[PDB]
Design a protein around this ligand. Sequence first.
Ligand SMILES: CCCCCCCCCCO[C@@H]1O[C@H](CO)[C@@H](O[C@H]2O[C@H](CO)[C@@H](O)[C@H](O)[C@H]2O)[C@H](O)[C@H]1O
Ligand SMILES: CCCCCCCCCCO[C@@H]1O[C@H](CO)[C@@H](O[C@H]2O[C@H](CO)[C@@H](O)[C@H](O)[C@H]2O)[C@H](O)[C@H]1O
Ligand SMILES: CCCCCCCCCCO[C@@H]1O[C@H](CO)[C@@H](O[C@H]2O[C@H](CO)[C@@H](O)[C@H](O)[C@H]2O)[C@H](O)[C@H]1O
Ligand SMILES: [F-]
Ligand SMILES: [F-]
Ligand SMILES: [F-]
Ligand SMILES: [F-]
Ligand code: NA
Lengths: 125, 125, 96, 96
Amino acid sequence: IKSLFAVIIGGSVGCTLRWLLSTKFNSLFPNLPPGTLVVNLLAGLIIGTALAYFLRQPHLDPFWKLMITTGLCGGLSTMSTFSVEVFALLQAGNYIWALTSVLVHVIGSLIMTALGFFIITILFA
Amino acid sequence: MIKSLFAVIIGGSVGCTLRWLLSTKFNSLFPNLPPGTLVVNLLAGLIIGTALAYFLRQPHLDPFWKLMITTGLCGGLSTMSTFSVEVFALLQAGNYIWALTSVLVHVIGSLIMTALGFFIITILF
Amino acid sequence: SVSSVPTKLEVVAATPTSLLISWDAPAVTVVHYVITYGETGGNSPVQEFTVPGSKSTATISGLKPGVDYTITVYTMYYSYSDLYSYSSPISINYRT
Amino acid sequence: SVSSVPTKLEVVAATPTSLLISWDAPAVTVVHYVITYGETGGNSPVQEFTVPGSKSTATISGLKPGVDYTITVYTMYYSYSDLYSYSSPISINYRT
Ligand SMILES: CCCCCCCCCCO[C@@H]1O[C@H](CO)[C@@H](O[C@H]2O[C@H](CO)[C@@H](O)[C@H](O)[C@H]2O)[C@H](O)[C@H]1O
Ligand SMILES: CCCCCCCCCCO[C@@H]1O[C@H](CO)[C@@H](O[C@H]2O[C@H](CO)[C@@H](O)[C@H](O)[C@H]2O)[C@H](O)[C@H]1O
Ligand SMILES: CCCCCCCCCCO[C@@H]1O[C@H](CO)[C@@H](O[C@H]2O[C@H](CO)[C@@H](O)[C@H](O)[C@H]2O)[C@H](O)[C@H]1O
Ligand SMILES: [F-]
Ligand SMILES: [F-]
Ligand SMILES: [F-]
Ligand SMILES: [F-]
Ligand code: NA
């Protein structure tokens, strides 16, 4: 039950952030909706910084770890919205941007995870 | 905007909870391509595809239910962030074959489920 | 806030039995455009056909000479909130 | 429920000043193994080094002949719940 609250509180903050950022910004550039990109890149960054930080602090409460990763990053990021965007582009005959969206979301999200991890790893002494 | 926020939170909380339960139960069974994280992305791809086709035919549905299913449930259920750390960890572990396989199976698989969801409903109606 | 309806629908070229129409795409992911046409005098069936989202022109053939036609174009488009929905139409009258 | 501790830690080969050790990998994504070694006698300092997650063998060098060493191996591994954390060690004694 305590773990469930971490997932719900974190998840609700993440989903809310995705909803606000997506409705505000996605329509500005519909070939690669920037609201959905920014939340995936940001979640990649946070999970990477979490990866490195939680390694150095092994005695932290599993509550905070679960709220940040499964909750916040889990709620904030999305594979499903990413898929319809690409599917729609594929149906629209816009293959160049379908391919670009797949590369920028995936390669970009991994790069942000790397950045988050290595920035914290480089900070420690 | 408060009624819309409840749809996002209720849907998001159900999705995040489902991801949490399925991931902790199944991810450790096959760590090269954690099946809990895959199943939730594939399932969210399926639901958003069926939503794509279904909501097209029912244009007068409440924006509440549409928002709860897509931004809420599918948004909370799917994840790009957990997908990234899994791949990042595999890359750090020197396991490139499964890092590449995970990227292809998650992305190609999630698009295929979106297509299946869309065309199954399109073929029904 | 962004409109999914096309703008500047017009006949760019005409013969007595055909019309070449064009329009400006709306700033959304259009999957396909739906062109409709029928005789303005409302005693004849309206016909429709699709064009891909990349195209912003269409040919209408098999028309009768010297007759007023009502021509509309709407989109089937992707947006964040509505997923796949249909836009309102933009509409013009043209006499062959 | 899945153990992140390696199993069947053993010396596969030895010289007077070195040991080649091997172990079975645990069924989790191991990022690196941490090998530790020190003289079983007393409180001479324990030393450690890492080996990549793909390798399941390691060489320990610069040992003294005819001395009892305590050798341990633990993992730094990825799991869903704990992200990057350290396993418990598996341990053996060996006399050069
Ligand atoms: C590696 C990832 C694989 C994941 C699987 C994804 C499956 C993609 C489904 C594509 O959907 C089709 O796309 C065509 C092309 O966009 C559309 O053709 C439309 O456009 C064509 C030209 O662009 C015309 O020739 C067709 O008549 C017209 O229907 C067609 O309607 C649509 O159903
Ligand atoms: C797809 C788009 C790109 C996204 C961004 C890519 C980010 C990937 C980060 C990989 O991190 C490195 O992975 C190496 C393994 O791959 C590790 O090497 C370790 O393992 C090697 C052998 O596997 C040894 O040679 C090294 O000495 C040892 O440090 C190294 O520590 C680690 O920092
Ligand atoms: C897009 C990203 C851009 C930023 C890149 C900057 C990288 C700076 C760090 C240096 O790179 C690696 O750092 C690892 C440590 O962080 C070292 O691994 C060492 O330590 C690891 C554990 O910390 C072990 O897993 C490895 O086996 C061991 O070689 C590894 O040798 C070294 O090459
Ligand atoms: F998905
Ligand atoms: F996308
Ligand atoms: F992400
Ligand atoms: F993965
Ligand atoms: Na999510």
